[PDB]
């Protein structure tokens with residue numbers, strides 16, 4: 043019995059099917075009262091919501107799904123017809139995320155891609171019929187934020203205005219990614235100071251808007 047299975051069971055028994063807000067509230071209650079887990083959380087989640095509402099992206103890519111908390115958070119605010127693709131290397135987490143989206147009634151808006159982001163990103167154009175991405179949410183291996191951002195550019199997946207939103211830039215931290223985007227004329231950066239999910243520890247989101255080559 044895993045922590046991720048316990049979170050999914052808790053949602054199924056304490057939230058309303060087809061109600062994404064109740065799913066988010068149940069995950070946040072479980073993680074504050076029972077066991078911490080690496081979901082983006084409500085503090086950083088409110089900043090995510092404000093970014094999503096500002097840009098109303100039609101196609102979002104997420105790197106790292108975990109239990110589907112951030113996928114539910116983003117997908118619930120997407121416009122009819124807009125889509126989210128989420129890459130998850132851990133098959134057990136991918137199965138939890140699929141069941142979380144199904145319970146939230148968001149399954150038609152989100153596609154889980156099982157595998158490594160370094161292998162899946164080069165297949166987006168030809169296999170998944172992607173042209174360019176409107177937004178990317180980075181929440182996977184912290185040492186992969188920079189290489190995958192460089193890979194997205196190489197693959198022609200970024201366009202002028204693509205919004206990169208990165209979790210955990212302070213804790214655990216993404217020092218090479220932060221230094222790179224903040225020092226590059228190809229990105230316009232904004233830091234949103236906040237708190238590590240379910241903890242009185244400072245963390246933050248970085249928004250890095252791609253400006254073209």
Ligand SMILES: O=C(NCCCCCn1ccnc1)c1cc(-c2ccc(F)cc2)cc(O)c1O
Pocket residue numbers: 080081082105106107129130131132157158159181182183184209210213214238239
């Ligand atoms: O490691 C994290 N995420 C990546 C999980 C593996 C992704 C693998 N993958 C998925 C797809 N392709 C590759 C993470 C960790 C923490 C944290 C903070 C404080 C602490 F004391 C311990 C941990 C907080 C988060 O918010 C995080 O996201």
Ligand SMILES: [K+]
Pocket residue numbers: 080081082083107108109110111112113
């Ligand atoms: K999450």
Ligand SMILES: [Mg+2]
Pocket residue numbers: 080081082181209210
């Ligand atoms: Mg995170």
